[PDB]
């Protein structure tokens, strides 16, 4: 049985922000439950937005509006900025 997690990814991002700082296993578990939490939130709001507008497909627009609903203020603005840049670079190349 292989149970996957986000551990190595939070580790990589941590080494990007603070290359000299490590993280304990418990804090890694907290980060994992955080990523799963926020993921389920944005996915749920995307499902609601897709159901109310009568569409069967989740696109980047529904995820964008869901981010603008969940994240207050600057988290929403910078989050939509980073995500839009990521989809931009993704489909451009």
């Amino acid at each position: 049985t292989r149970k996957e997690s986000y551990a190595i990814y939070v580790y990589k991002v941590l080494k990007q922000v603070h290359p000299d700082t490590g993280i304990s296993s418990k804090a890694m578990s907290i980060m994992n439950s955080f990523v799963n939490d926020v993921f389920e939130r944005i996915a749920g709001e995307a499902s609601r937005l897709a159901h109310y507008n009568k569409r069967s497909t989740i696109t980047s627009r529904e995820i964008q509006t869901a981010v603008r609903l969940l994240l207050p203020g600057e988290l929403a603005k910078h989050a939509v900025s980073e995500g839009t840049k990521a989809v931009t670079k993704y489909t451009s190349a």
């Binding site: 609601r48 937005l49 109310y52 507008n53 627009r61 529904e62 509006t65 603008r68 609903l69």
Partner: protein, 82 residues
């Protein structure tokens, strides 16, 4: 057309009546402005959620359903309007 001082349109007797229904016997003179601030905050929240829904649907009209989804979005469910 800039609209200003419309929150003053909420009248002292209005808020007074709301408190009379809420069970308040005697009201201090400083309740009013604070109540206007609180109401303005609440309306900013609910209206930014509803207008967000309306922007996502590419519609120029804010339906009552959007307001219901904003209130249920905040955790306050409103029956009877859909």
């Amino acid at each position: 057309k800039v609209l200003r001082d419309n929150i003053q349109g909420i009248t002292k007797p209005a808020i007074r009546r709301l408190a009379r229904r809420g069970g308040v016997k005697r009201i201090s003179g400083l309740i009013y402005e604070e109540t206007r601030g609180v109401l303005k905050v609440f309306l900013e929240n609910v209206i930014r959620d509803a207008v967000t829904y309306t922007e996502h649907a590419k519609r120029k009209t804010v339906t009552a359903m959007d307001v219901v989804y904003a209130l249920k979005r905040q955790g306050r469910t409103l029956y009877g309007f859909g």
